[PDB]
């Protein structure tokens, strides 16, 4: 039922990586007042990987108190142990968490049964509803159209991110599902044709720097408005590339220190962007009107 | 220096996902008495991944207990959080591991100078001898032959698990490195290949099942005797195809099953071998006369 604009939100650090929980704060503030419709807590945007369980718990923590019950708040709670994304998941739906966002297990490459498995142990044991997602650039696996149509039939199974890209593929699937569950666009480059084709929403990097024109992108997409999707787009198509020149969240990360909201902290093996890329970030920044 | 035949383990588990203890002693006297090298606890064939933090050490503790030094004993302590691999890595050491291997982060991409820093924290943070793993398939992110040049310069970092199947690609790291650090393949299929051309052996999966075999082939191919690695590794050829018919260690951990070694648990999200593939197997089992 989530639909919109939906933030990635980076975790704020300080310069010792600790989190920042002062610039937290500000930044879902922030993003409240500009339009931003939910906020994906420690997704791959927030750092997940190199957040402690504690560390998880308290930034999922923190976001539902100062959302004060304003938008919905999805947790992040994906891990390639289904022992672990059962009890990641708990944790959010017992911390008040509105949904879980939950990769496909990376590294290890489950099959497609594994994959269906996986995430049916996990509806069964949670009472919350869940979001699939399949980035497999960077899990070594694809969850198929086939699979998602499979577990959109498991009850508290509500959705999926669709970080392919792949237009027609993203179609396909919104069209064999017939409102079984969501599909939400991972891809900011695609998002607003995704949205237009029936997505519910963008589970978006690019809202962490630019959220009123993502917001707004998101509106006029959804009630299917072609060419107010395409201008209002296009006036943050760059950033959508730039955003990845080096792996996201490292120029995200980058761009709100720019813009002063965060401060440089970002955890090893992740890197502040590299010196060469922020000269060209500033120039986009300034290109769009955000600094 | 640990060269030959170095198997990638399973780790044993009974019908309800716990870990089999005495089939994994059983194992690792196997291997002593088969003529295996070194052992590799808790790998990717190891499931490292659904094993606890407990449980890695347990397994760790006891590989070694078993082996008592007959031989050296590396313990897989890769994590996606240079944090963590930290953390895995002391704990290795603290063991008594001979050695660690570890991957490159996965899921979160690091940069190349990610990797880079990523490495040299955890070689300065640990005094033991570490061996990098590149396996751009399952993570995502690829540590360039470059990035492995660099890093072999930082002092107890001793070799590199290359498990691209990049021949040519393996042979230019080889001759580059001009004996740096040790080059082991991570490719059954073309590790006969790489040790004629200079690999100091090959963490293997096929071990596992024909440690004997894997041994001899390993030692006439460090030898440089090209006809004795074809005609060895002939006889085994279609197991290092077959044990990759679904992802590693699932035909690994059903082979095993069916030479009565191991019972059929394995940890969700990997699923058991599926029933399609089982006779499949059995045979090249049969024709290579390991049942
Ligand atoms: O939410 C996530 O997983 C994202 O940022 O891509
Ligand atoms: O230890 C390992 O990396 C393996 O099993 O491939």
Redesign the interface.
Known sequence: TIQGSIVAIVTPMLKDGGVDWKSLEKLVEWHIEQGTNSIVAVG?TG?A??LSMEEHTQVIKEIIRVANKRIPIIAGTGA????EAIELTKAAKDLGADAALL?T???????Q???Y??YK?IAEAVELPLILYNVP????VDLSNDTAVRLAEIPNIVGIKDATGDVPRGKALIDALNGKMAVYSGDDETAWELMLLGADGNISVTANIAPKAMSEVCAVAIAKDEQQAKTLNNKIANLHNILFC??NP?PVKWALHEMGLIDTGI?????PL?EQYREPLRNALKDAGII
């Open positions: 791959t750092e990987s190199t390639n142990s289904t022992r990769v297990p990376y590294y290890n490459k489950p099959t049964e594994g994959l498995q996986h142990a650039g960077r899990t070594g080096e792996s490292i955890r090893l093996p992740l890197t590299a």
